PDB file of C-alpha atoms in Angstrom:
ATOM      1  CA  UNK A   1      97.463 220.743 157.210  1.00  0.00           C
ATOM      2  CA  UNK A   2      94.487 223.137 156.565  1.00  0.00           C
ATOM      3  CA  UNK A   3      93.882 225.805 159.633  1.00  0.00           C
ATOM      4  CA  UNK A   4      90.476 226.333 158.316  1.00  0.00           C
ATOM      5  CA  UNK A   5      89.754 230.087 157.451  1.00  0.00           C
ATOM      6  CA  UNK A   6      91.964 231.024 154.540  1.00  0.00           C
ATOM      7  CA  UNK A   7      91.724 234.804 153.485  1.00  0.00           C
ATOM      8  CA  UNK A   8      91.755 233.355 150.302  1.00  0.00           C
ATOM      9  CA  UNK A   9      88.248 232.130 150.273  1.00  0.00           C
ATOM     10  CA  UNK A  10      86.830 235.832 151.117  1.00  0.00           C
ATOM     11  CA  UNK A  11      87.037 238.324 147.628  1.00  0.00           C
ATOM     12  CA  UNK A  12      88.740 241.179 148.862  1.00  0.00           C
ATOM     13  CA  UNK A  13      86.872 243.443 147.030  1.00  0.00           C
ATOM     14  CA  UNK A  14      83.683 243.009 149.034  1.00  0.00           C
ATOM     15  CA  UNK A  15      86.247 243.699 151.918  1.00  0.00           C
ATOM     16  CA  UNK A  16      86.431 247.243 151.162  1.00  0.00           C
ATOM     17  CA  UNK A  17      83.630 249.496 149.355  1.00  0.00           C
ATOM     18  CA  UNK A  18      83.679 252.703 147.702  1.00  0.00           C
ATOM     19  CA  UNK A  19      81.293 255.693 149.045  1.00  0.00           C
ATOM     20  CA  UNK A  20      81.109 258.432 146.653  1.00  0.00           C
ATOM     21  CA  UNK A  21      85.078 258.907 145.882  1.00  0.00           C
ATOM     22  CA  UNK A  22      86.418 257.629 149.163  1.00  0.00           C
ATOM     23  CA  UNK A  23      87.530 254.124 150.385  1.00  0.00           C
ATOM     24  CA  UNK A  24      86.762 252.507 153.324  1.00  0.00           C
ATOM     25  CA  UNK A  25      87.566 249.375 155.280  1.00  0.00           C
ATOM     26  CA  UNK A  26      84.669 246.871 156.262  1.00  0.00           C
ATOM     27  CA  UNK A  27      85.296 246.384 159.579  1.00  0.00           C
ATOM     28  CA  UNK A  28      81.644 245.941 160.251  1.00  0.00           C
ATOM     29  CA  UNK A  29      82.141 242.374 158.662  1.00  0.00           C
ATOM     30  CA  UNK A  30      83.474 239.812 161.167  1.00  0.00           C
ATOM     31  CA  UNK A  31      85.625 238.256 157.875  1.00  0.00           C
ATOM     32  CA  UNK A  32      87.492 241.316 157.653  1.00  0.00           C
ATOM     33  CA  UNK A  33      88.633 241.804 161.384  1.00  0.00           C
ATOM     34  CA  UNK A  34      88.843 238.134 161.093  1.00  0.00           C
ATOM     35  CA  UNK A  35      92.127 238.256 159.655  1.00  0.00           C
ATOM     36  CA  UNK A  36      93.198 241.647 160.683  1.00  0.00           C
ATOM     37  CA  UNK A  37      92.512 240.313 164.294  1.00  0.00           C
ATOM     38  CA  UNK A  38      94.402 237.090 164.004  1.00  0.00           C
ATOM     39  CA  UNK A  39      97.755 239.631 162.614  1.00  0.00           C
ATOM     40  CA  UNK A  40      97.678 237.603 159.571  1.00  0.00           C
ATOM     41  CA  UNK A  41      96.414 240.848 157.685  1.00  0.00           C
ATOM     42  CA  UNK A  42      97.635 244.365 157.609  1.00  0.00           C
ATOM     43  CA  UNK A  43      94.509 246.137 155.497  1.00  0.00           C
ATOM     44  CA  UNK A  44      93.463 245.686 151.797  1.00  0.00           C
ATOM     45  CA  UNK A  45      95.570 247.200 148.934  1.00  0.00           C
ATOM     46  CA  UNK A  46      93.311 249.347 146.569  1.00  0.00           C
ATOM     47  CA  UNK A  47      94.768 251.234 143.334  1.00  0.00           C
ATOM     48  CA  UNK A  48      92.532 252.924 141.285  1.00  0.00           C
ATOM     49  CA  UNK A  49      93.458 254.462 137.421  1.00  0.00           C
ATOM     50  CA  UNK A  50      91.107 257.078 135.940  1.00  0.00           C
ATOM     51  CA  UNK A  51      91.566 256.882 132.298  1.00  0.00           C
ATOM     52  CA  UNK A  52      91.160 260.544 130.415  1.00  0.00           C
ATOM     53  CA  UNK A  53      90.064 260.562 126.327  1.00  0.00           C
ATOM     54  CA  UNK A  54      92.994 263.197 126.271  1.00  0.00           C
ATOM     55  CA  UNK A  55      94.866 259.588 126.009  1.00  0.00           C
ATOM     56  CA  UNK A  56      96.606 259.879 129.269  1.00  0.00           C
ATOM     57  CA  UNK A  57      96.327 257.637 132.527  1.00  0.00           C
ATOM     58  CA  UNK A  58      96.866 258.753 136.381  1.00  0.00           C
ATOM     59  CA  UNK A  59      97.220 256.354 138.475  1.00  0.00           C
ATOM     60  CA  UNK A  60      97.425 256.661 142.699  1.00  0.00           C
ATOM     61  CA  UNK A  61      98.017 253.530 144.939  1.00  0.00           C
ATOM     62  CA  UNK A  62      97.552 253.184 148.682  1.00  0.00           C
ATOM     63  CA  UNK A  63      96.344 251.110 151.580  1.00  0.00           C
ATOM     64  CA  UNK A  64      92.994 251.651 152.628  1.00  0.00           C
ATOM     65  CA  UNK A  65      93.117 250.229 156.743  1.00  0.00           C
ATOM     66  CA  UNK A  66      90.142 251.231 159.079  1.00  0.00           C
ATOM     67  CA  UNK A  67      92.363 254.599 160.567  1.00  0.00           C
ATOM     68  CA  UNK A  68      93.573 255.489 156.925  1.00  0.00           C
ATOM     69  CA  UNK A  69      91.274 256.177 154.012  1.00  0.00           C
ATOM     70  CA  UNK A  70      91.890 256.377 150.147  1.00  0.00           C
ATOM     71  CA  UNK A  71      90.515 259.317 148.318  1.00  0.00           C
ATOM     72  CA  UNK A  72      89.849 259.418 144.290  1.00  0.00           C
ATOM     73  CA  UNK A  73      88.990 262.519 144.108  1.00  0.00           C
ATOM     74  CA  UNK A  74      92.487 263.460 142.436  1.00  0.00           C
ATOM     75  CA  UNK A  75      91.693 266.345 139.712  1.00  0.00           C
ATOM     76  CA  UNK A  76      87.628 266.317 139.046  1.00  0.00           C
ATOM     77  CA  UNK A  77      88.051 269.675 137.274  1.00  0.00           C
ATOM     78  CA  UNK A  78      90.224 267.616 134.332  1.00  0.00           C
ATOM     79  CA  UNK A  79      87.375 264.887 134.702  1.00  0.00           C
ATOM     80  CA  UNK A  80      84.653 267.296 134.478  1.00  0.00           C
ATOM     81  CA  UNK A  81      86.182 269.051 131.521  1.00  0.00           C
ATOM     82  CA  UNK A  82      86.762 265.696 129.656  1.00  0.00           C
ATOM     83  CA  UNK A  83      85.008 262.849 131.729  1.00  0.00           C
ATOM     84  CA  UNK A  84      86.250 259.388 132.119  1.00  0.00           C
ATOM     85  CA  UNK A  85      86.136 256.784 129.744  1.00  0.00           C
ATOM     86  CA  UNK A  86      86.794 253.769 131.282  1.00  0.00           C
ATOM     87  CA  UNK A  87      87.228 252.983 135.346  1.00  0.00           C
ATOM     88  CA  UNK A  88      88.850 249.849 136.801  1.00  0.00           C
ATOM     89  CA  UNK A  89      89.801 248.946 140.768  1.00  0.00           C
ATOM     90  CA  UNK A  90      91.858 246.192 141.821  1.00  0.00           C
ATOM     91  CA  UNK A  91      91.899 245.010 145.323  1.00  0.00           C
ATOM     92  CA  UNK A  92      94.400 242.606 146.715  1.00  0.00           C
ATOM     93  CA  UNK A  93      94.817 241.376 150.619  1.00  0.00           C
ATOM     94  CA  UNK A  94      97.847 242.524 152.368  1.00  0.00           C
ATOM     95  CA  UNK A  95      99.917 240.853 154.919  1.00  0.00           C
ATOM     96  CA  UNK A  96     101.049 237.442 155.001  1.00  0.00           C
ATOM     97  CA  UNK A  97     101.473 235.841 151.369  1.00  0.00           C
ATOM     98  CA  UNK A  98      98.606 234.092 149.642  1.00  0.00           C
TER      99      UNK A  98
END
């Protein structure tokens, strides 16, 4: 049987948004301390890749929860030098399976 809310009807990358080159968790949004409330969540996974036309990829993972935030801001003298090409973010829930 169906208990109703499913955290897989809620896009978890409205969950968490990005401010400037930090990460932050929603908490603001009754969906997201929906889940976290109920234990059934633990945060949302972000991992973010900044892609350099020197041909070579960085790429830092971590878990962005309301106490712990995520910052890009990994080597902006390289980025400035060279820029970025391309930028892609994935965002995944994390807890219980599915």
């Amino acid at each position: 049987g169906g208990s109703g809310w499913n955290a897989d009807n809620v896009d978890p990358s409205q969950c968490i948004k990005q401010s400037g080159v930090q990460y932050t968790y929603n908490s603001g949004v009754s969906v997201c301390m929906q889940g976290l409330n109920e234990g059934k969540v633990r945060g949302v996974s972000v991992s973010g890749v900044f892609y350099y036309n020197d041909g070579t990829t960085s790429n830092f993972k971590g878990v962005v929860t309301p106490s712990t935030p995520v910052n890009t801001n990994q080597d902006i003298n390289k980025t400035n030098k060279v820029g970025v090409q391309k930028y892609r973010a994935l965002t995944e829930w994390v807890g219980s399976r599915s």
